[PDB]
Every structure is written in structure tokens, then in C-alpha cells.
Amino acid sequence: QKFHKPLATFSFANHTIQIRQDWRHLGVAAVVWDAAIVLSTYLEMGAVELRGRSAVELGAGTGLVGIVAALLGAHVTITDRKVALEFLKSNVQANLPPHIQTKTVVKELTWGQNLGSFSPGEFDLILGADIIYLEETFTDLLQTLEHLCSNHSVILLACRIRYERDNNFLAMLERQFTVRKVHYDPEKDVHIYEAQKRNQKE
Numbered sequence: 001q002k003f004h005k006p007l008a009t010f011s012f013a014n015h016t017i018q019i020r021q022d023w024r025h026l027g028v029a030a031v032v033w034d035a036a037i038v039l040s041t042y043l044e045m046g047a048v049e050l051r052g053r054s055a056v057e058l059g060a061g062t063g064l065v066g067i068v069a070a071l072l073g074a075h076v077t078i079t080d081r082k083v084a085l086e087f088l089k090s091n092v093q094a095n096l097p098p099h100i101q102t103k104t105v106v107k108e109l110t111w112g113q114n115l116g117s118f119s120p121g122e123f124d125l126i127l128g129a130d131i132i133y134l135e136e137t138f139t140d141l142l143q144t145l146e147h148l149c150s151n152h153s154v155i156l157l158a159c160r161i162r163y164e165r166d167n168n169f170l171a172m173l174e175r176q177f178t179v180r181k182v183h184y185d186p187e188k189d190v191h192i193y194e195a196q197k198r199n200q201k202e
């Protein structure tokens with residue numbers, strides 16, 4: 001029902017964020033999911049180092065998490081697939097001051113595709129809010145995390161565990177990475193997992 005609203009408004013990092021929404025004509029990438037609100041709240045509370053830190057957001061959708069992380073001092077590469085790009089670029093540009101904008105990159109990253117255009121030790125922080133849902137690209141997503149996550153890098157995945165497939169991806173993630181519960185929101189039923197490369201000796 002919140003999805004039907006043409007505009008979703010939030011207060012994060014001493015700023016009013018006005019997200020344009022389009023559930024009807026664009027769908028999933030054009031609405032703010034609860035996991036993006038929960039992850040953005042967690043980033044604000046202080047357990048994560050953000051100031052001057054290199055960050056990438058995967059499947060940003062509207063871009064809330066990436067916007068909040070940028071406003072909190074990170075150098076964020078806010079990404080999604082080609083079809084979501086235009087709408088993502090519009091919410092980012094209209095919600096960031098120009099001094100934050102120069103430290104922000106809005107570009108495409110389709111999971112497991114053109115991974116070579118990204119440096120394996122480029123990002124210290126990897127973000128994803130409610131991006132676990134499409135079984136057909138689970139391998140694509142794991143190959144992206146494995147390509148981007150250096151030994152120092154931390155992954156923060158905010159999830160709504162809906163079906164068996166969700167636990168399956170988390171088991172796939174656990175094979176190569178340490179996966180630890182760092183936050184749980186009962187009313188929104190969202191868990192934030194932190195992931196790190198397990199065998200750092202390679």
C-alpha cells in the first residue's frame with residue numbers, strides 16, 4: 001500500500017530524502033523496500049565506518065541506502081541493472097548536494113556481467129538491501145560478491161527471508177564467506193547479515 005504512493009519521504013543524516021516511486025509502471029526497482037529503511041537506519045547508528053570509505057551498492061533500486069551512505073561520508077558507486085538505471089539516476093541526483101554528488105558514481109552493474117570493469121580491491125564496503133529473490137541469478141550475485149569483496153572489505157546484506165530459496169542463497173554465501181547476524185528488526189521482519197571472505201590466505 002506504501003508502494004502506491006508517488007513519493008516516499010525520509011529523514012536520514014540531517015537530510016530530507018524524497019524518493020519518486022513507480023510501482024504501477026516500473027515495479028520492484030521503483031519502490032523503497034523495508035530492508036532499505038532498516039539498512040539506512042543501521043548505517044546511521046554508528047557500528048559501520050563510512051567517512052571517506054569506498055562503497056558500492058548492489059541492486060540500489062531507488063537508491064535510498066546509497067543516498068544515505070553518501071550523505072554519511074562514503075564514496076559510493078550506486079548500482080543496478082540497465083532497465084533500473086534511469087530511475088535510480090533521477091532519485092540520486094535530486095537528493096544529494098553538489099559536494100556529495102562529486103564523490104558519488106551512478107553506473108550499471110548487472111550481476112556477474114562485465115565484472116572486469118571493476119577492481120577486486122576497489123570497495124571497502126559492499127551494500128545490498130532486499131536483493132535476494134531471483135534464484136536464476138543467485139550464481140551471478142555470488143560471483144559479483146566474490147569478485148568485489150577483498151580481504152579487508154565487509155558486505156552488509158539486509159534481507160527479508162520469505163521462502164526456502166532465501167536460506168539457499170545464504171548457504172551458498174556461507175561456503176566462501178563468514179555470514180553473521182548483526183541486526184534484526186521485528187516489526188519489518190528484516191535481518192542484516194555481515195559477510196567477510198573466510199579464507200583470507202586464498
Ligand SMILES: Nc1ncnc2c1ncn2[C@@H]1O[C@H](CSCC[C@H](N)C(=O)O)[C@@H](O)[C@H]1O
Nearest residue numbers: 029032033036059060061081110111129130
Ligand atoms: N541481475 C541483476 N543485476 C543487478 N540488479 C538486479 C538484478 N536482478 C535484480 N536486481 C535489482 O535488485 C533490486 C531488488 S528491489 C530492492 C531495491 C532497494 N535496495 C530497496 O531495498 O528498496 C531491484 O532494483 C532490481 O533491479
